[PDB]
Ligand binder design. Structure first.
Ligand SMILES: CN1C(=O)c2ccccc2NC(=O)[C@@H]1Cc1ccccc1
Ligand SMILES: O=C(O)CCC(=O)C(=O)O
Ligand SMILES: [Fe+3]
Length: 287
């Protein structure tokens, strides 16, 4: 049984129901190739200078990722394509509002480019969020997913170059005794395609077997606004913030947030008023 493949335009309403049922779907042409090109060009130098995940100069080293992984997050100050095109993706927002409506507003838990060096080994099969949000393990097993992960190919995903592994249905597994690479299927994808999984989907990056190809992806973990993002936009220059849409501002933590509770009293408010109202935060002011 293979990962279902859906069109970003044609099949839009089918995407989240497909993930909710099977734990994974491939969104074909999630980002256009022109956006992929621009993202790539804009993040390239930051990828090249990024040290190892656990670099000694970091005061929050990532000890989990392999030394042949590079991960660059807080993309808004680096990439116009990301902060305009990606953060405003209609497809992305329709899926997130489909996924998160029971909880409320959602935001970017982390937007990162990952680049894997040739011969990068397969990651251990895993669910996300367990090195950041242990609260998630305490959720009842039937609780709606509180985060999801769009793994967007910025270069080709093939079985040979380490395309992601997923276990279909594994987001509903309580008993993990059956986890093995035996149960996986691959996300074979063209640049701009996205693999969409939930925080309970068991998955892993694949083994890069060519010894030559450098695989790159954009991972967008979207999560309910009641959960703290893994990354901070607090240091993004205010001019950059004020060039965004209000929606993009909210996604980066530069706006207040709402839950779905009928009498919701809000998140990140100030004596009854929003961040953006208190600070008189402008939007869509070009640089
Ligand atoms: C550790 N880890 C990340 O760094 C990561 C990277 C991109 C997007 C999400 C994310 N969150 C995570 O929880 C993963 C978990 C993991 C990663 C590699 C091997 C085993 C487990
Ligand atoms: O490399 C991949 O395709 C998967 C990345 C991943 O699962 C993670 O880093 O949490
Ligand atoms: Fe993962």
């Amino acid at each position: 049984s293979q990962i279902p493949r859906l069109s970003a335009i044609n099949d839009l309403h089918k995407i989240w129901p497909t993930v909710e049922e099977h734990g994974a779907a491939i969104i074909e042409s999630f980002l256009s190739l022109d956006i992929v090109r621009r993202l790539n060009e804009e993040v390239d130098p930051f990828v090249k200078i990024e040290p190892i995940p656990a670099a000694k100069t970091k005061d929050h080293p990532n000890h989990v990722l392999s030394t042949t992984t590079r991960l660059v997050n807080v993309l808004a100050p680096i990439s116009k394509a990301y902060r305009e095109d990606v953060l405003n993706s209609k497809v992305l927002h329709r899926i997130c509002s489909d996924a998160f409506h029971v909880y409320g507003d959602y935001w970017v838990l982390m937007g990162a480019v990952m680049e894997l060096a040739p011969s990068n080994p397969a990651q251990p099969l895993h669910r996300d969020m367990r090195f950041s949000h242990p609260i998630v393990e305490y959720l009842k097993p039937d609780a709606p997913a509180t985060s999801i992960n769009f793994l967007v190919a910025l270069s080709p995903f093939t079985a040979e170059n380490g395309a992601t592994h997923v276990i279909l249905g594994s987001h509903k597994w309580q008993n993990l005794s059956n986890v093995s690479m035996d149960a996986t299927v691959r996300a074979l994808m063209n640049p701009g395609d996205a693999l969409l999984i939930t925080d309970s989907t068991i998955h892993c990056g694949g083994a890069e077997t060519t010894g030559t190809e450098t695989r790159r992806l954009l991972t967008i973990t979207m999560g309910i606004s009641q959960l703290t993002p893994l990354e901070s936009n607090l240091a993004v220059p205010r001019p950059v913030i004020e060039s965004l849409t209000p929606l993009a501002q909210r996604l980066l933590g530069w706006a207040s947030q709402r839950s779905a509770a009928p009498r919701d009293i809000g998140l990140l408010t100030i004596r009854g008023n929003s961040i953006e109202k208190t600070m008189n935060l402008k939007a869509e002011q070009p640089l």
